[PDB]
Write a protein that binds this ligand. Structure first.
Ligand code: HEM
Ligand code: HEM
Lengths: 360, 360
């Protein structure tokens, strides 16, 4: 059995980023109440740090409402993030990274306030949904005095054991999703993900762009399979680039067909999203969402697109701009409906707390 | 693996009842459209039967819009049920069992139309939520011409492999839930679950009472642990009756405390819910639900209470009435907000389809 497995809470980095993605996630987006300043934020982060320290190791939180749901942590992780409004409330604008601001508008955006922004992120990931539901309840119990819930975004991947660790998993459009990514345990990952410049408190942390992206599955069902593959640049079943044979063949962006047109389209998703330098790649760690049906049978499903990077301006915005300005073929069937940005602090040890280097 | 494992679709009984409950479930409640009569119902059930026959074994459905999501069936099962309103639409009123009718009102009820009733049930269970999401889309694709979606209720238990097979699992109140239950593959299970009297088409089937029961978790948090255990009649951690030591000890309903009062309260849940005859028990096969938060951090969570029994009038109603008239202490923290009843036909083989004995 696997319920006893844990991920370390303490370390130079917060868990939940380099951690291989678990089967379930909740992204809890919180707005600070009017009276919540620097002193209140310290009290809150000390509470939440201790909750995570205990629950991730299968021990009840202090004042745990349901202590029997703490054992069997199933690789529970907490990742805390600070939005732009957190720095304002704390009086710490000078410590806010220049790039930590709401993203610029893109033509494809259909953003909704109810899925956007947020002052404080609690990202909770777990291989088990009961453990996760309990961790969320404890988080809200300790946060409620200081914050209001702005949004809660629940997502899933494959259940534990359904696919081998490291095997690429499919999204709700049926596509293999996650082939090209920095790999933990390599110097390129550390360069791409962990902050080294800017405000000193953030060194060893990262940044997160969280975009709720709706999938237009009724339109997708009506699309021709050859057109679906051409829009991405990869085949559906194998995941191989259209220029290759296996999933991990490198896409050949110079290849042309017998008539001279690019094999991978000028506006194919993977062409527009690609960056040459491995050190500038974003870490994509997405979850799928599926929520409810209209009376005439239309789905409400999509992707919780979570991208982690050391620098939003250098590693996220240029890619998103190329997708938008290049007219990504995938935009015919996907629509951004929420967007939020967070600075993710470095990790802590025992006797410390998440955010201590900024708020303490 | 957890992903390649299957459950047989064919047999004397439909799967998903005696099948040990998988990690995820969706209960899809459908209403028949105006033009959907007996002829349209037969066509619909033949379509859904063939979809299930294929998808449960990891093969794409006919005209599958995302066939790459069919492999890794992860113990997918489908269970189809017919509500009271289906029989009038088929012109088969005299084939409706006497006991197939909405439950009578109970004082604790706060039922909502959006969680209640329904002409046709598709219960889809699976160890994997991506497989389940795809199965749901395939079901809706084939049913939407003949029906409208009345509700969709998603629930979860532990992820696969978190606990050993057969071990009792906890609900969102932290309670072990499922201790006293007919065991699949036993004579008592067959007597309690599978219909043997009444209209011939239903023999080998069962009936389902599906109740969405909200847990008042904020009030539950205000309760002391002694009161929580007293309200049920069992200890939280061990699951043992208050009169015993281990989970599977028989409760001693005659034992009294030092004050001469029953150890298991006169209005304790397990006393009011208990039936002496194993052949009259109901099979409880519940799922947990957790859906969204108010701005002030109030949860929307509870139990998808699914009870299967050969006779609702003899096996469900008397228990539910005793909980209501007896003033079950658990009623302080639980509220029924939806209720639906279905007749579940017997299984089929490779030559037939679900409901053929009624609709063919
Ligand atoms: C619902 C929306 C989206 C879907 C369904 C989707 C799907 C995919 C697929 C199937 C691939 C190819 C396999 C892989 O390497 O993972 C891919 C690659 C990629 N996607 Fe997306 N994507 C979405 C949104 C986005 C967005 C908003 C970005 C913004 C930056 C993005 C960035 C990337 C990158 C950087 C790659 C790697 C391309 C390469 O270098 O080969 N994706 N995506
Ligand atoms: C609504 C939320 C409910 C919760 C949280 C709940 C919880 C529990 C718990 C903790 C037990 C003891 C362990 C076990 O044997 O499973 C139990 C037993 C039982 N419950 Fe419930 N229950 C709920 C609703 C209901 C309802 C509506 C019924 C209606 C029939 C019911 C029928 C039973 C039965 C028959 C037993 C076995 C009693 C025995 O013979 O020992 N439960 N329940």
């Amino acid at each position: 059995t696997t319920g006893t497995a844990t991920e370390p809470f303490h370390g130079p980095h917060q868990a939940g980023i380099a951690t291989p993605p678990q089967a379930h996630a909740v992204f809890l987006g919180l707005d600070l109440r009017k009276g919540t300043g620097r002193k209140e934020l310290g009290r809150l982060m000390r509470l939440l740090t201790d909750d995570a320290r205990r629950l991730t190791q299968g021990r009840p939180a202090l004042a745990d409402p349901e202590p029997d749901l703490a054992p069997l942590p199933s690789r529970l992780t907490f990742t805390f993030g600070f939005g732009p409004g957190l720095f304002k409330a704390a009086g710490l604008e000078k410590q806010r990274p220049e790039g930590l601001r709401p993203l610029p508008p893109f033509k494809v955006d259909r953003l909704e306030d109810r899925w956007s922004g947020g002052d404080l992120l609690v990202q909770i990931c777990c291989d088990d949904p009961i453990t996760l539901a309990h961790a969320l309840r404890m988080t809200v119990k300790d946060a409620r005095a200081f914050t209001r819930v702005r949004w809660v975004q629940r997502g899933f991947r494959r259940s534990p054991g359904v696919q081998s660790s490291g095997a690429t998993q499919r999204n709700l459009m049926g596509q293999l999703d996650g082939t090209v990514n920095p790999v933990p345990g390599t110097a390129d990952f550390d360069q791409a993900v962990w902050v080294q410049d800017g405000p000193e408190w953030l060194r060893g942390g990262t940044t997160l762009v969280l975009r709720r992206i709706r999938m237009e599955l009724e339109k997708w069902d009506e699309a021709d399979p050859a057109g679906k593959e051409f829009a991405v640049g990869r085949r559906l079943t194998s995941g191989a680039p259209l220029t290759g044979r296996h999933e991990h063949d490198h896409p050949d962006f110079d290849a042309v067909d017998s008539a001279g047109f690019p094999v991978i389209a000028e506006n194919a998703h993977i062409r527009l999203a690609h960056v040459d330098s491995p050190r500038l790649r974003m870490l994509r760690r997405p979850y799928n969402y599926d929520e409810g049906l209209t009376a005439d049978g239309r789905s409400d499903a999509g992707l919780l697109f979570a991208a982690y990077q050391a620098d939003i301006d250098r590693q996220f915005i240029p890619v998103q701009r190329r997708l938008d300005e290049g007219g990504d073929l995938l935009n015919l069937w996907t629509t951004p409906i929420g967007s939020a940005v967070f600075a993710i602090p470095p990790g802590c040890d025992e006797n410390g707390w998440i955010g201590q280097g900024l708020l303490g």
